[PDB]
DNA sequence: AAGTACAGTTTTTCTTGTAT
DNA sequence: TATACAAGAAAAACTGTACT
């Protein structure tokens, strides 16, 4: 699950939704939509993975 | 641009818009847009880099 | 013909405001 | 202070059809 994956990586970077949104260059509301199953493929997918030290690949299919 | 990059490697791989469309899970129409510069951030980005045998970063950033 | 682009409509993601 | 809801705008998707 992408939402579960984001939520877990950010909680563990010890970031907040708004703090993350900042690094990713988006809004808190986008982070939530993502974290809450309202978005499958955000436009900020690349930056987000970059801001989580992960791979777009691990986010989408966690592999 | 990403457009540039996509169009090149498409041709370099000898693929047409519709056969890349099928490798990536999209429609040629969605391909023509990205290529023709309509679309800024295609959702199939990741599927695309795999198909074009490159990376998301080079695709969006080149280098 | 076969490959590419155009158009209208619809789905999805964003944005901004707010409520728990 | 942190996260969730929600209505409308916008990006971008689809289907169909038309260039070349």
From Swiss-Prot, chains A, B:
Q: Which GO terms describe its molecular function?
A: DNA binding
* Bridged cysteine pairs (disulfide): none
Q: Which residues bind DNA?
A: 17-36
Q: Which domain of life is it from?
A: Viruses
**Keywords per UniProt:** DNA-binding, Repressor, Transcription, Transcription regulation
The segment(s) forming the HTH cro/C1-type domain are 6-59
Tell whether Ribosomal protein is among the UniProt keywords: no
How would you summarize the oligomeric state and partners of this protein? Answer: Homodimer, when bound to an operator.
Q: Its biological function? A: Binds to two sets of three contiguous operator sites in the phage genome.
Q: Name the chain's protein.
A: Repressor protein CI
């Amino acid at each position: 699950s992408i939402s579960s994956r984001v939520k877990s990586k950010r909680i563990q970077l010890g970031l907040n939704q708004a703090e993350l949104a900042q690094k990713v260059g988006t809004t808190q509301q986008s982070i939530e939509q993502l974290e809450n199953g309202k978005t499958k493929r955000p436009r900020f997918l690349p930056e987000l993975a970059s801001a989580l030290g992960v791979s777009v690949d691990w986010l989408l299919n966690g592999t």
